Nucleic acid binder design. Structure first.
Ligand SMILES: [Zn+2]
Ligand SMILES: [Zn+2]
Lengths: 47, 248, 51, 107, 209, 186
RNA sequence: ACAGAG
DNA sequence: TCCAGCTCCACTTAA
DNA sequence: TTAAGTGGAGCTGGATGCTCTGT
């Protein structure tokens, strides 16, 4: 998550504005790329 | 004089907690964590407000996270500490971050629906009186505060005037507001026409629009309803109810 | 060829910055309870960090 | 404030241990005991304005004076001109007249 | 505070005095002109003053009709008045054999008690007024023309002059605040005296429906 | 909760608020000088701006290439590992490399002196790399960790890995297109 | 379906 | 492109 | 403990100026 906040911005108010999206992702148990692909794959409208 | 006007201005205009606090800090200690709010009492002196630590303690515990009154203390006359507990519903105990950005938006004084209020002074040379143009949507609250002459205050929204002062005051409001809008663009209608319009809107005890929704409650003829809007649905409804129709 | 490096660094345990209560649980989660034939961590704790 | 784990770089959370409150990672054993006072001050914006308005000088800082209205002919005036309707090939004006506080507003 | 809180208990009491004087209940002249500094006399500030049961009005009898036609005015203390407090006032009203009562709630009423005030009895009719509506007399407001509740012998002469029925008149609802001020039920006709731009006056009529 | 809260005209003393605020959080439980309670000074948590890592403690301008080479030469005798970028082609012929006029890089040249570096008056720094002089500019300043390693595959399956040092600064070289173009205008 | 005109 | 009705879902009172 | 009546949020279905003059 440190690299995400590095890419978004390292100002104070920018981090304060972005914080509730990290706090949302930590509520679910997504911490690994396989977990994130498993979460996104079950939202896909199956064609 | 304007010294009296700013008091009742500050009694109705919505003031946020963050607007009077000079810093809002989180303090982590080895035994407890909490959030500290220091009030800027010089600005309370200059804005002429009826707020201190005990009033902010009572404005908090109103629809914020269900904090308890035991959690909030009033250690000085300016400092207020808010110790948080477990939200326990789709949130982590690190909900200190929620009150870090949500507690500055609580209301401590005034009416929650008033966006802003302003002091407006007159033009005459024989007098100088100070009225109060309020940009909000709560007539009942602005009428009822101490120091506002509630018998002579009005609105532009006819729905609030109908809800508070009755159907007849709403009729008068429709007349005054249509005539005011026609005067401001240089037009000129005889007042009997807007009088007939206001009496047509308010003869069933309720202000009814000139939409298809207000017209569905006034007129009884089925083909008059079906000749204007929603042409299909009125026909099937008159078939369903077996509704007969005069050609009057 | 196709240059890709993997490292493994050994973090200590005797320092105060290692919550052993969480380390025992994460080592029980990753490894088996008593298998230790092939194992990510050697001891009963999270010992390594892979890069 | 955001603080991140030296090990894995996830976001730390504050929790309570057996001797201190700790910053702790959710995904690795790293914890940091809060031994001393640590703080973060927001310093928000105060409500700077008081905003009294509507003075007569704030009304008559517009050009026109000593002209003639068709109603009461008074000199102290407040004029306006529009053109933004090209169905109106003639010009468009509106006038305010307040020397005797008569208050006309016509075309 | 305590300069503005006793202000509310003065102003609400004054407006209830006028509301009882306009419904034909006997109000003495001094209660309609009870000065704030004179209201300080019989009750001081909140440590000496007592809110809920010291400011009740049960003196009010219909001096037009009958001395046993009496009406309460209660000031409950809690902001959201539950069913239990309504039952307390109803059994007190049962004891004194009074039929009409008012309740001045401070912030609101719980939705199971607003349902209660309709269906407890047709003989026990109770009216909820918020304390924020009583901070001004809405009849004194300049947008509200003077309403007059009409007698049956005047409704009959109205409907005979224009040759009408009752259901062809214009309507006013019973949830109208000026209708609840006078306490009027379905089937009464009010007379509205509208002021004009001239010195003239235009009279009009509304049926409660 | 009693709503009718009372207030007074008296003016708050400045120090009285200061000392109340002081007394509200200056209490410390740092008396536990114990192992668990102790904390490792070289593993503090990372505050997010990497130049500004220190949030807890025991208690910027942008430099240029002439100030870069002056501090490494005059101020200190200690050597420093740089990381410089080149232009895409270096101004040479591939020496018997079986070509086409393709790109000439450092992988095609030989050992020996390849050029000279001229630090001019008033901050101008050039890289004279033959008959043409390139232009040297400081690149984006990195503040994360960079290590310069030697990976040697002495055997088919095993070998040596050795760290040579940390790289701090990044230089950028670019051809001076105005001087290249002012020889023969077009 | 597009362009005009008042 | 903008706006009333209809239906789903948490949130207190009350037993 | 839970039955229930009522707030707030999302979905749905409706509507958007008058004529002639030609291809
Ligand atoms: Zn970590
Ligand atoms: Zn004029």
């Amino acid at each position: 998550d440190q690299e995400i906040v590095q890419m978004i911005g390292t100002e104070e108010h920018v981090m304060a504005a972005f914080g509730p999206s990290l706090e949302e992702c930590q509520k679910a148990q997504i911490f690994t790329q396989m977990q994130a692909l498993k979460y996104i794959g079950n939202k896909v409208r199956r064609q | 004089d304007a010294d009296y006007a700013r008091l009742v201005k500050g009694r109705i205009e919505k003031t946020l907690l963050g607007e009077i606090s000079e810093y809002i800090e989180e303090v982590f200690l080895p035994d407890d964590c909490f959030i500290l709010v220091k009030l800027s009492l010089e600005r309370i002196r200059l804005l002429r407000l009826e707020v201190n630590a005990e009033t902010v303690r009572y404005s908090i515990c109103t629809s914020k996270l269900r904090v308890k009154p035991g959690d909030v203390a009033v250690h000085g006359e300016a400092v207020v500490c808010v110790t948080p507990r477990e939200n326990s519903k789709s949130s982590m105990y690190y909900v200190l971050q929620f009150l870090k950005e949500d507690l500055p938006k609580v209301v401590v004084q005034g009416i929650p629906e008033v966006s802003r209020a302003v002091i407006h002074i007159d033009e005459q040379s024989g007098k100088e009186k100070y009225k109060l143009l309020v940009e909000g949507d709560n007539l009942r609250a602005v009428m009822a505060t101490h120091g506002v002459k509630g018998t002579r205050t009005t609105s532009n929204n006819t729905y609030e005037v109908e809800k508070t002062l009755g159907i007849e005051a709403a009729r008068t409001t429709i007349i005054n507001e249509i005539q005011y809008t026609m005067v401001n663009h240089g037009m000129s209608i005889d007042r009997r026409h807007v009088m007939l319009l206001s009496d047509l809107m308010t003869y069933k005890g309720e202000v009814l629009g000139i939409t298809r929704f207000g017209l569905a409650k006034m007129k009884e003829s089925v083909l008059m309803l079906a000749s204007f809007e929603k042409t299909a649905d009125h026909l099937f409804d008159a078939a369903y109810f077996g509704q007969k129709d005069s050609v009057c | 060829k196709q240059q890709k490096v993997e490292l493994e660094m050994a973090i200590d345990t005797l320092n105060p910055n290692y919550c052993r209560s969480k380390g025992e649980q994460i080592a029980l989660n990753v490894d088996g309870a008593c298998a230790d034939e092939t194992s990510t961590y050697s001891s009963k704790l999270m010992d390594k960090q892979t890069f | 404030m955001l603080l991140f784990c030296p090990g894995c770089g996830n976001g730390l959370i504050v929790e309570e241990g057996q001797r201190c409150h700790r910053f702790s990672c959710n995904t690795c054993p790293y914890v940091h005991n809060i031994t001393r006072k640590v703080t973060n001050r927001k310093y928000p914006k105060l409500k700077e304005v008081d905003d009294v308005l509507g003075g007569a000088a704030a009304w008559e800082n517009v050009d026109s004076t000593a002209e003639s209205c068709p109603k009461c002919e008074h000199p102290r005036a407040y004029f306006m001109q529009l053109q933004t309707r090209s169905a109106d090939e003639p010009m468009t004006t509106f006038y305010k007249c307040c020397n005797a506080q008569c208050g006309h507003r016509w075309r | 505070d305590d300069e503005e809180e006793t202000y509310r208990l003065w102003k609400i009491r004054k407006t209830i005095m006028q509301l009882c004087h306009d419904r034909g209940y006997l109000v003495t002249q001094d209660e309609l002109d009870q000065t704030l500094e004179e209201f300080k006399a019989q009750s001081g500030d909140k440590p000496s003053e007592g809110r809920p049961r010291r400011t009740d009005l049960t003196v009010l009898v219909a001096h037009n009709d009958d001395p046993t036609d009496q009406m309460f005015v209660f000031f409950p203390e809690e902001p959201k008045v539950g069913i239990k407090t309504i039952k307390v006032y109803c059994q007190r009203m049962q004891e004194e054999n009074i039929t009409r009562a008012l309740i001045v709630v401070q912030q609101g009423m719980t939705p199971s008690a607003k349902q209660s005030l309709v269906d407890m009895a047709p003989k026990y009719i109770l009216e909820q007024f918020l304390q924020q509506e009583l901070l001004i007399n809405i009849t004194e407001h300049e947008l509200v023309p003077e309403h007059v509740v009409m007698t049956k012998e005047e409704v009959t002469e109205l409907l005979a002059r224009y040759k009408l029925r009752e259901n062809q008149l214009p309507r006013i609802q019973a949830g109208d605040p000026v209708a609840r001020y006078f306490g009027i039920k379905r089937g009464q006709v009010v007379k509205i005296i509208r002021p004009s731009e001239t010195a003239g006056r235009y009279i009009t009529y509304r049926l409660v429906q | 909760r009693p709503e009718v809260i009372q207030s007074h005209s008296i003016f708050e003393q400045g120090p009285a608020e200061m000392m109340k605020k002081k007394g509200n959080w200056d209490k410390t439980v740092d008396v536990s000088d114990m192992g668990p309670s102790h904390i490792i000074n070289i593993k503090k948590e990372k505050r997010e701006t990497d130049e500004e890592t220190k949030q807890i403690l025991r208690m910027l301008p942008k430099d240029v290439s002439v100030a870069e080479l002056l501090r490494e030469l005059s101020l200190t005798k200690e050597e420093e590992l740089l990381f410089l970028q080149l232009p895409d082609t270096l101004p040479g012929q591939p020496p018997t490399q079986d070509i086409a006029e393709n790109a000439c890089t450092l992988a095609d040249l030989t050992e020996g002196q390849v050029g000279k570096l001229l630090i001019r008056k008033s901050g101008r720094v050039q890289l004279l790399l033959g008959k043409v002089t390139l232009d040297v500019t400081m690149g984006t300043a990195c503040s994360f960790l960079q290590e310069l390693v030697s990976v040697g595959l002495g055997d088919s399956r095993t070998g040596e890995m050795t760290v040579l040092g940390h790289v701090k600064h990044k230089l950028v070289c670019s051809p001076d297109f105005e001087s290249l173009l002012d020889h023969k205008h077009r």
